Curated annotation (Swiss-Prot):
Cofactor: heme
Effect of residue 452 to T: In GLC3A; juvenile-onset
UniProt key word Zinc: no
Effect on the protein upon substituting residue 361 to V: In allele CYP1B1*3, allele CYP1B1*5, allele CYP1B1*6 and allele CYP1B1*7; 1.6-fold increase in 17beta-estradiol 4-hydroxylation activity but no change in 17beta-estradiol 2-hydroxylation activity; 2-fold reduction in testosterone 6beta-hydroxylation activity and 3-fold reduction in testosterone affinity; 6-fold and 4-fold increase in progesterone 6beta- and 16alpha-hydroxylation activity, respectively and 7-fold reduction in progesterone affinity
Disease implication from the record: Anterior segment dysgenesis 6: A form of anterior segment dysgenesis, a group of defects affecting anterior structures of the eye including cornea, iris, lens, trabecular meshwork, and Schlemm canal. Anterior segment dysgeneses result from abnormal migration or differentiation of the neural crest derived mesenchymal cells that give rise to components of the anterior chamber during eye development. Glaucoma 3, primary congenital, A: An autosomal recessive form of primary congenital glaucoma (PCG). PCG is characterized by marked increase of intraocular pressure at birth or early childhood, large ocular globes (buphthalmos) and corneal edema. It results from developmental defects of the trabecular meshwork and anterior chamber angle of the eye that prevent adequate drainage of aqueous humor.
Protein family per UniProt: Belongs to the cytochrome P450 family.
Protein name: Cytochrome P450 1B1
Designated gene of the protein: CYP1B1
Induction of expression: By polycyclic aromatic hydrocarbons (PAH) and 2,3,7,8-tetrachlorodibenzo-p-dioxin (TCDD).
Tissue occurrence: Expressed in heart, brain, lung, skeletal muscle, kidney, spleen, thymus, prostate, testis, ovary, small intestine, colon, and peripheral blood leukocytes. Expressed in retinal endothelial cells and umbilical vein endothelial cells (at protein level).
Amino acid sequence: QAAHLSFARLARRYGDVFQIRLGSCPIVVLNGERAIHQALVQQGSAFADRPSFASFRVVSGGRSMAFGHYSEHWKVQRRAAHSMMRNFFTRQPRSRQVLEGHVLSEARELVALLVRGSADGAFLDPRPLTVVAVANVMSAVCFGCRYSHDDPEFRELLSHNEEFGRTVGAGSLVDVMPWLQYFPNPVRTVFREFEQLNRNFSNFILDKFLRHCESLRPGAAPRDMMDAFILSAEKKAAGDGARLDLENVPATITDIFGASQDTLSTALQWLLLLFTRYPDVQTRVQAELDQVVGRDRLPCMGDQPNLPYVLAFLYEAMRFSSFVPVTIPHATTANTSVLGYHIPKDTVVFVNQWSVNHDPLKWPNPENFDPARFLDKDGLINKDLTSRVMIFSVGKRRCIGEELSKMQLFLFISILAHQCDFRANPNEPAKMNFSYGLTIKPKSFKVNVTLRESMELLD
Ligand code: HEM
Ligand SMILES: O=c1cc(-c2ccccc2)oc2c1ccc1ccccc12
């Protein structure tokens, strides 16, 4: 009875567009591509707002770009945030390399713990490990500092991503049923933890913020995204496009660091999950990797176009898993209509991406994981299908770190699959259970990892 599941089901009787009621709020769910594309794209702007939920307000000390409203001040915050994400990567020559180094560097520490903690036929839950590996890629990209996988204070800071999606996830009752805060219950519990975690994240980034600001003297060369945003803001305040104001820099680096670390973490956990539940797909991608990059070195972004199956497994896991089933709730900015239906200004809207990835007609093997589903008659991928998958949303509020997400999940998996073997715990009868909320996170599950060959990952 997962949200995105009921909605897609209610659509088989009331159409793609219809409205539900969560407590006091009547939400209008969008389910198909034409409806999703007609609201978010064609009438994008009418649907580019965020609902006035008290919890959204708590994120990033009240200055979130992801959870804030549509307005001019917001408009430059996003433009400025998207600018950093586009330029930051591919800004200077050899930049791609420094990025790939971080991934390569976390991939090494990641396989090492997985293999070490999997000796003699042992199994271990990969999740905690995958969060730390992805947060470090971004800890270094954003602050220029990575943490020890043993670091408690950091593993703690990142041990609450589930409480975050349960609070803001479409379906959540925290906002729409405030009376639930009046007494003990899971909803009272999650929201209080929610405030607790956002409070910790902000302080974590605030501390780093104040230090980068202090060390960034006149002629100083920025060596971060923190340093990059601060410089830009000082250059903005200091006389004379879209750049952030110093007061908004901590909040926006929080959204940036927070999203990636959560989403990329969740995504990664599915890849290994799928690898262990589909040994054959694991072998094929693991085969193509051997044929193209050779057992002679480890994969790099240069190999991406000669790896049609890897990219295919990538988009199949994306469509099949739909780990971000419904986008961050939207809100209309003006009375509008979609697929005929009237939608009055200031109404909360849910975009069902899962309903576009699981549409029978567009995807024949709807419930079956078929990476070949994206392979062209002669073995190459066809953007026409690969780009038919919806996970990063579309429109004004579409993800700002899409290419980064991709040129990273490709790498983590390329190294891991090329260097390791993943086996599921056979003794586990009942199946994998998940936690629904913004992202679909896998609940506890154990894998066993062994090295195909000697570590050349060691530098
Ligand atoms: C595979 C990983 C990721 C997926 C599937 C994903 C997807 C999404 C989705 C579904 C949204 C909501 C769109 C909407 O409400 O209409 C979004 C928001 C956003 N994403 Fe991502 N994301 C991921 C990675 C990233 C990364 C790496 C960053 C960090 C740079 C990031 C930052 C953002 C931001 C700042 C927003 C809010 C944008 C806005 O409100 O306008 N995401 N993403
Ligand atoms: O701004 C955020 C966006 C996002 C986000 C997540 C998924 C998709 C889009 C945005 O999440 C977070 C954010 C901030 C802090 C978080 C702390 C824990 C877990 C997630 C956080």
